[PDB]
């Protein structure tokens with residue numbers, strides 16, 4: 001099908017900027033906005049829904065919601081501390097909410113009064129974060145919500161002549177903010193779009209293709225996520241020729257691809273994001289309301305992503321005062337101790353092409369290292385490895401100690417790899433040397 | 439498709455005899471015959487192939503092979519010590535080679551001279567084992583090879599009038615031995631046929647249906663394996679309508695059914711068999727030539743079978759002297775030590791209807807117990823349980839202790855059934871209380 005506004009990449013991008021986005025592998029997400037103030041409570045009622053949607057849950061008028069700017073004073077905010085927290089965690093990039101659905105900008109936009117500038121704190125939070133993260137060697141990605149609850153020219157659908165004209169004004173406004181972010185903060189490496197699912201955006205595929213090109217023209221090598229993009233026909237993420245639009249698929253949140261049934265995902269770049277609670281992105285005061293993931297449950301999902309050729313981003317919702325809740329400091333600390341030991345099987349790794357086994361995941365390094373990441377320790381003391389046609393295992397090594405690991409052939413294309421003599425007592429890595437028959 | 443010699447069961451038999459066959463779940467195989475004497479070596483060459491096929495590997499003439507009878511003298515043999523070893527192991531049934539391809543009979547058959555009777559030992563080994571196993575409360579099943587290298591009336595195909603005349607004589611001989619086993623040893627619970635794959639048997643489907651019928655008449659509630667059976671069109675195991683013949687499917691000697699892709703096996707009774715080495719059933723003197731399974735690799739396979747509504751039989755190949763090699767005594771000892779702790783999860787258990795998880799297998803007790811048989815201990819300290827649509831986990835208990843196990847709900851239809859407060863330190867069992875509505 002001829003499309004003017006469909007996909008622009010033939011397979012994965014291999015330019016250095018995309019290779020860096022991919023090699024980074026582990027990200028953090030920051031959700032910070034006016035929603036951190038009520039933290040899921042409005043007018044004495046606590047709402048179970050995602051805190052950053054509280055304006056919706058509590059049916060708050062825009063005027064009353066955005067009045068929260070008068071209370072915005074994150075006195076314990078310290079962009080250097082935040083960047084050290086991310087660096088200690090082992091995050092290679094941070095994705096920041098520049099503007100959520102609420103419409104409150106974390107940078108002093110000249111296109112709205114609903115920004116950091118018009119609060120008691122006054123400071124350009126986005127700018128302080130970009131510089132602090134960048135000083136730590138950490139890449140910065142901008143989340144941006146097209147849907148904007150603060151602009152009455154937004155429309156969910158086009159059902160009239162006045163909807164058409166208002167939505168045209170809305171797209172001009174959106175272009176102004178996007179160009180302003182690209183120009184103010186040229187170290188930006190990615191635009192992660194949200195609030196682009198409505199019938200209104202679907203009917204403006206041309207506009208989604210325009211925003212992608214506009215930002216690519218302003219920011220050499222910038223990445224753009226698939227959630228932005230609709231084609232000529234208003235088909236999202238993948239065009240009507242089934243090709244991926246944008247630079248990477250960003251449709252995975254809180255259910256990762258099946259390691260046996262979804263090997264299709266290894267054909268394109270992709271990024272999963274995840275919450276620590278079941279479904280809280282912004283600060284919610286009461287994490288007793290849903291299940292809260294442990295560090296290992298989070299590390300399992302990071303390795304799972306990389307094992308299938310994808311990035312993983314772990315969300316944080318900072319407190320209204322500018323500090324991180326205890327649960328989130330414990331998470332970043334725990335992930336960071338594990339990444340310092342075992343990160344060689346995450347950073348710059350990818351799909352290995354081996355059949356999934358029960359003990360954990362395989363990942364593949366740039367020089368054909370095959371890492372076994374063991375999450376489930378067999379009582380048998382043998383890790384089953386089934387090799388693809390023509391692949392043999394020549395050696396196994398415990399990554400953290402360098403100790404040689406016994407490898408025994410059990411049948412054609414199957415080995416037992418021995419567990420370490422001493423139980424590592426957490427998820428661990430055995431590095432395989434393998435050979436391809438010519 | 440209209441069939442006279444297709445399936446005789448509609449779904450699973452549920453008479454007490456089949457319920458016993460199924461509840462037993464854990465079997466032992468015994469491969470014992472003349473092949474135990476050479477143990478895979480013939481004229482100074484050790485053959486790497488299955489030792490019970492040595493006659494075929496070394497191309498031994500029947501006359502020369504069957505002369506091994508002259509050396510058959512297992513003076514270390516004691517059926518009571520065999521029946522005790524099987525009892526310690528937690529085996530509920532024993533499948534015994536009455537006659538393997540070589541055609542040497544472990545019972546004094548009237549229809550051939552190639553029997554224990556015509557050896558120095560003289561004694562009815564089969565009858566001795568039947569009594570010893572039965573007195574320890576162990577069911578006894580008869581392996582029987584229709585293909586018989588001792589009888590020149592055997593044919594692989596029927597391509598001449600002489601082929602027809604000879605094979606007809608061979609089927610008469612086969613019926614005689616089958617009738618003789620069923621009458622001499624009426625405690626027999628099952629006949630597990632082998633040597634039935636040749637065009638000669640496939641083209642005589644009527645006969646396979648006759649041997650099943652004849653044995654079911656002589657032995658009330660006897661089981662008959664799928665391997666015997668060919669229908670009217672020569673379709674084996676499953677008839678041309680896709681319906682299982684005999685009382686259970688006998689396969690998965692190479693690989694067990696896949697826990698995700700082959701849930702279809704839960705629809706019929708089935709039994710897997712396995713070797714401890716990669717492919718040795720009869721005694722082979724050199725177990726260094728292939729990989730030898732550890733006890734936990736064997737218990738993994740047993741639990742896998744029951745988790746998919748199947749039986750598992752672990753093979754033993756006794757030495758020519760009538761004793762068992764050190765590796766087989768260690769295996770039997772270890773399987774029993776584990777089965778005494780955790781056997782509630784195996785005996786009289788079946789498919790649980792739960793989505794397979796990485797840490798191990800579900801089995802279902804007769805009263806809706808759900809056992810998590812944990813082989814792969816998560817560092818997370820959380821065992822993921824996705825329940826089917828309309829099931830909840832009310833509690834969890836370390837089977838060996840009484841100790842209660844924290845269940846946490848995580849999403850709709852998912853839990854972190856906690857691991858036991860203390861790590862059972864081997865494949866272990868946590869028991870779940872479920873509830874539907």
Ligand SMILES: C[C@@H]1O/C(=N\OC(=O)Nc2ccccc2)[C@@H](O)[C@H](O)[C@@H]1O
Pocket residue numbers: 050052053194195251252253273281
């Ligand atoms: C990154 C997160 O994502 C969102 N929305 O994304 C989706 O709705 N994703 C989605 C929905 C259905 C299927 C797949 C993805 C936001 O509304 C949320 O507040 C947060 O910023």
Ligand SMILES: C[C@@H]1O/C(=N\OC(=O)Nc2ccccc2)[C@@H](O)[C@H](O)[C@@H]1O
Pocket residue numbers: 488490491632688689690691711719
């Ligand atoms: C029980 C064992 O089984 C045999 N044959 O069985 C099979 O080959 N079984 C099989 C093969 C393919 C698919 C399913 C079952 C015999 O030749 C062997 O000596 C041993 O007695």
